[PDB]
Each structure stands twice: as C-alpha cells, then as structure tokens.
C-alpha cells in the first residue's frame, strides 16, 4: 500500500524481463529429471545468480492502492477498491447477481 513497498516489488518485476526472458531456458534443461541416468550437478550447484530474482517472489498488488492480499487475476485490484469500482459504473459486465 506504501510507495516504498510497491517499488520494492517493481524492482522484482524489472529483472523478470532480463534474467527470466532468455537465460531461464539455459537452466531449465538440467534442473528437471532427465530420462537418462546422467544428470549434471554443475549447473544446479553454480545456481547462485537468482538471489533477488525469482518468479515466485512476484505479488500482483492493487493497481490503485497496492496491498498484497485478495488479488483477483481477472481484475488486478483488491476486494475493497474492486468493489468501489463496480458499485459505481467503472467496469463493463459487473452487475448485481442472484445465484
């Protein structure tokens, strides 16, 4: 929700299109279990570069405020503000439901 916390996660999004764009397929060939008995340790051992880099370290956050919890993949917003948008008229096909 803070401009210091959203920024810390925006720096985790910038290296996703640098390290995980092309050189991720370089380690994805040997981290998995191959059908053959010869599985190399050399690349799984020297796997030191992804310190701050990880695809699982990414949290979606709200696009208006920025809180880590209750994020829906379709909208991208959190349950408090996602509500304020549909209670007005800011999203098409977000009417009242029965069942």
């Amino acid at each position: 929700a803070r401009k210091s916390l959203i920024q810390r996660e925006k720096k985790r999004r910038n290296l996703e299109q640098k390290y995980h764009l092309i050189r991720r397929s370089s380690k994805q060939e040997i981290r998995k279990v191959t059908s053959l008995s010869d599985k190399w340790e050399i690349h799984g051992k020297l796997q030191s570069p992804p310190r701050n880099s990880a695809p699982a370290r990414l949290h979606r956050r709200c696009f208006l405020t920025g809180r880590p919890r209750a994020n829906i993949r379709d909208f991208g917003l959190s349950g408090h503000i996602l509500r304020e948008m549909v209670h007005t008229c800011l999203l098409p096909g977000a009417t009242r439901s029965s069942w």
Binding site: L64, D74, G76, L77, T88, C89, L91
Partner: protein, 217 residues
Amino acid sequence: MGQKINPLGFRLGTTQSHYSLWFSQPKNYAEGLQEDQKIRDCIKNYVQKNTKTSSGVEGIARIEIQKRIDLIQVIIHMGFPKLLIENRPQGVEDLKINVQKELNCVNRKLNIAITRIAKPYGDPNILAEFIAGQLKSRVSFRKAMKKAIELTEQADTKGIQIQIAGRIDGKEIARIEWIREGRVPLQTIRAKIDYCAYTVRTIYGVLGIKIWIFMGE
C-alpha cells in the same frame, strides 16, 4: 454508515449504463482496467502542476470509454465547454498528447469528442462539485444545502436528497445534516436515480457528499 443501497450500483442491469463499456480477453483484462483508471484520474483532476486549476471549475458530468481494438472513445460530458476546448486552440491540444504519452504499446489512436448536458442542475456530478466547493470557501453550510434542494426543483425534477458525514464548521464531535423535498423511492428499480461521491480538502478535517436525484418513473 447505516444508509441505503447505491442507486448507481443497484440500477446497473437496466436503464443506467456503465461509465465504461467494452470487451477484452481475460489475459489482457487487468491492463484494461489500469489504462481506464489512470486516464480517469488525469481528466477529473487535470493539472500537471501543483495548483487548483482546470476540470474542477467547469464541472465534469460523465466519462464514457468505449473500445474494441487500439482506439478509445473517451467522450466527456461537460457543463461549460469553454475551459476544456479553447481560449485560442491550445487547451484540447495539450490534452491530446497527455493521454497519448501514458498509453502506448500498440498504435493507440485516441479520439476525444465533447458533448453538452441540458442543465447542470439535473446531473449529480456538478452538484457534488458545487456544494462541496462551498465548503472550501467556508460559507454557511445549512443555507447552502437548502439552496441545492430548490435549485434542482426549479430545474424540473420530481425529487432530490443531499447528505454529508461529520466534521461540520469546525466542531469536535461529528454530526449529520439531512434536508429532503418531494419523494425519493430508494428501494425500487424503476426510478432511475443517479449517484456521485466527492471529497473536500479542508484544514480541519475531511467531508463526503452523497447526491440522490430522482428523475422519472
């Protein structure tokens, strides 16, 4: 607090349409809300510097955004089109590039047209910026609320209701003010009542106005 249902949220299925009516695939749907909310925050305020200038003086009524592929409609309903368009063709020119610099990726050819309203005392969005604008200049509150009731009744309406929350005239304890005239059917769907919500600045606290204008049945 313990109020009734939102008349803009209850009447979403029929009569009153959305402020944004489009379609997108669930892959690029999240980017569709981000691009439509960033421009709605830049057109309602519309100030590059740290001043209290444009958009809030003319009064914005409704912002309808319609898109298919690479083109947005962004048609803004204004009360006075003298401030947004010209003083000599420079006003709409800096608004055409401001929305273009934010939204890129694909060739986003944005066309912005302008339409007028019959009378500014019929729509709820001008009333939320007019009565809340009287709180900024520190005028008598209960006299400004009773004037907002009559100014809409003379503009041919069947009912009107206005109410704020706490922190009136610099009081320590939070109270509530309510004045109503005519009939405002809060429950029914065949009433087509429009809503708006606006916030005030104030050095002592913060206020929040709610507008309820009943048109036809």
